[PDB]
Amino acid sequence: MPVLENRAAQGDITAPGGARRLTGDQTAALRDSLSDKPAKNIILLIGDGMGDSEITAARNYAEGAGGFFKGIDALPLTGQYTHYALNKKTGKPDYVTDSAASATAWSTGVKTYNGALGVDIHEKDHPTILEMAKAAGLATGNVSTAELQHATPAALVAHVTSRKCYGPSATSEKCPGNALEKGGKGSITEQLLNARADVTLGGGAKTFAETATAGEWQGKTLREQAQARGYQLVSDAASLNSVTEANQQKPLLGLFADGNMPVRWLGPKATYHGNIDKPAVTCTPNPQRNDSVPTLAQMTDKAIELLSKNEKGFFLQVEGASIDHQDHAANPCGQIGETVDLDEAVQRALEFAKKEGNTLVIVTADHAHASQIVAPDTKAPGLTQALNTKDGAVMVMSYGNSEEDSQEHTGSQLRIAAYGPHAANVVGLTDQTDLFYTMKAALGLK
Amino acid sequence: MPVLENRAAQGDITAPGGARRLTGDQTAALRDSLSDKPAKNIILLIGDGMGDSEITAARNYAEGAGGFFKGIDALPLTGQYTHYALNKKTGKPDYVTDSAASATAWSTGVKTYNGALGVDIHEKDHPTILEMAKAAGLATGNVSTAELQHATPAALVAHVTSRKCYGPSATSEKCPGNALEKGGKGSITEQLLNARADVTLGGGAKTFAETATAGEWQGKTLREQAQARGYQLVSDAASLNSVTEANQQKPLLGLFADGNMPVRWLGPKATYHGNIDKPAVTCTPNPQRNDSVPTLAQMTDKAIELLSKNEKGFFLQVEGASIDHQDHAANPCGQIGETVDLDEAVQRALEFAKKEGNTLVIVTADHAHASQIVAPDTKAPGLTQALNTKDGAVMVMSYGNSEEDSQEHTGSQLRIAAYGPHAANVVGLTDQTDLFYTMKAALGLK
Ligand SMILES: [Zn+2]
Ligand SMILES: [Zn+2]
Ligand SMILES: [Zn+2]
Ligand SMILES: [Zn+2]
Ligand SMILES: [Zn+2]
Ligand SMILES: [Zn+2]
């Protein structure tokens, strides 16, 4: 099964055939990309808010319009999927989902309301693909650049009526029925610890400082509970690299930041008439991204290495989180840098998947976002910014779907690409909940 | 070769698996959708400005979130392609293309600057897929809901330095080098008449009233020229239905409107805080759409019928034009109605293509647009409107990328779907210029 080695402009963009990405008929290559045998492993790469627009903006800036993302764009089977949520009261569709309801849709196969994690509109729990993979004996991984309490990673291990129920404190107040001291299963964090994935890497070390309100570990900080339960904790890249075992007996919990991990690129925020009144921006790397902080690609590589020791196979979800945050923040450079960041991780996954031959890799996003690529001389009512792309030309990005502090999500259907056994199931129009069924069947999960 | 007969939510959206669009593994069906034998015919359906956002908004409103477009969504092979244009002075990419440069890209295989038709950045002419198809002996059709002088349909038959050079008058002034009286090939309209496609259906009958400034038909209106050249003219649905022959000897020229043909649905324009201050809108069919005016689907069916008499095969380009116009106008109802209108036309093409067995059908857009689907309670800086969808729920659409009169195009890559021989060539990431080579090869054009 081949991966598109190169879909970049073949030559001089100004000449006939120069901007072509294909070099011949693709029929045969596509025939070789189709396989229905079981998938032994599954790596799900999620770019939060990485719609088609976000991918194009990132490509234009970092690789050039005629460029090609060695990871994101290398997947052969492509399609578009819907991610509408449901209104809790009416059961009718809610065209623009949040990160919680969408994550639940692909992790459980059931639609839900905005803000929900692992439960339907009737607040009923549903087993996640991770819980199922684990029950079947497969190694499980949950990686992300955001706080592990964040919607995307949480959705695979917690079941709460509200994404806001991070630790004991918030839970008791906002999620009474889930409150441990009220007979519930506990907060997102407490449930994360219970779920016991083999590898869990992300940020949000601050929340682990809270103390449990009940149970065996009442009075103990969640960090202490983690230690007492057998979790091997790592907080930097050096220690992460020293890890050799990651199993049910010695599960790994990496906390590399108080909150979300540092953004890769710095750049100013978009501004009213920014492409007109202000000079073009060139993004600069974040001096604080550190050498002590592992990159998304590094975390992915480690998770793969450790999870691959399991004879049964593994399920790994990797999230390029900050694309969504920086999109909300209307910060082009942050948004793009996180997309480039994700690309690298996709590459690692594709490299392993190609050698192993029985790995289904899927790259997609939970929902679309605000950013739009508009003409240079655009006078928009929102925030805009002009950037100096790799092409030596200027690209203007716009965010104008909110007068408030944060730019909002959008409902547009978006790309989903895959590679390996059962990838055909992402082609054409599909729903986000179909992804749950695709992964479960590919893994023969039962 | 099968077409997705149903990719709608299989059941109760609120229950597990209820929102799924798939009923089983798609590997086999996809393997049956792959074929490399020659395509005897080609039907290219273009939705002007019909990006992924536009398609979703139209589906949500007309069919429901869990709904399915029997035409637009029925195509099995899908992917995403780029449509950046070029800066005339520098040769560097211009991330947001106009309707002219994009149409030129797929019709000639060479990128060009915004505003150009059938020429590269050095203003050099390049033969179009239509001119080539004709030269090879195939029947050719050029259908659209806009004026035939419009960029999309014009791109297949005219070569001018500016899309503004509609008739003799504008040409002499804006395109000196193309002006007939100055030794050029003539205006867009004059060149259309020379090109002599077998079937050409659209609007823009007004422009045909201008008089030629030179040549054999100097002093004669372009309409009279058409008649003297042997073109059989029709101006309504009754007469269009009476047509039995459409060939090089008796080519058909249908002009069904002074300008662009009537919009299918009426509704108010989006407005500032419209989803807040104003009531939800239910689109209403345009009373003036008429029974005397053929619909896009009717024109398509006639073109296929007449073009299918040709033993060699045919090339037909059909355009759902007003999607773009109504998008500029920030009129949700007009935008969606035109997408529903195009869906019907895609259905007729799919039906024929399925029976014939050797027809490559392609449905795509020249570039993305402004409209975004945002949350109901959104307070946006632009124009917004709440709509009553088929789901009995409300969807809010937003346009906020321009403070000026018209909302602008956007640079995001967008969907391209195909069906039939050589459809595999649209899968994955590709460039718009690749479509030229795909069609030429599929047709074995030489
Ligand atoms: Zn999200
Ligand atoms: Zn996220
Ligand atoms: Zn978000
Ligand atoms: Zn256009
Ligand atoms: Zn058009
Ligand atoms: Zn336009």
Curated annotation (Swiss-Prot), chains A, B:
GO-annotated biological processes: protein dephosphorylation
Gene3D superfamilies: Alkaline Phosphatase, subunit A
Binding residues for Zn(2+) 2: 48, 366-367
GO CC, alphabetical: outer membrane-bounded periplasmic space; periplasmic space
Principal location: periplasm
InterPro entries in alphabetical order: Alkaline_phosphatase (IPR001952), Alkaline_phosphatase_AS (IPR018299), Alkaline_phosphatase_core_sf (IPR017850)
Active site: 99 (phosphoserine intermediate)
Free-text remark on how the cofactor is bound: Binds 1 Mg(2+) ion.
GO molecular function (one): phosphoprotein phosphatase activity
Main EC class the enzyme belongs to: hydrolase
The entry's keywords: Disulfide bond, Hydrolase, Magnesium, Metal-binding, Periplasm, Phosphoprotein, Signal, Zinc
Catalytic reaction equation(s): a phosphate monoester + H2O = an alcohol + phosphate
Cofactor: Mg(2+); Zn(2+)
UniProt binding sites for Mg(2+): 48, 150, 152, 319
Localization per Swiss-Prot or TrEMBL: Periplasm
Binding site for Zn(2+) 1: 324, 328, 409
Protein EC: 3.1.3.1
Disulfide bonds: 165-175, 283-333
Protein family (similarity comment): Belongs to the alkaline phosphatase family.
Xref: PANTHER family: ALKALINE PHOSPHATASE
Record's subunit section: Isozymes 1 and 3 are a dimer of identical chains, isozyme 2 is a dimer of heterogeneous chains, one of each of the subunits from isozymes 1 and 3.
Protein name per Swiss-Prot or TrEMBL: Alkaline phosphatase
UniProt organism field: Escherichia coli (strain K12)
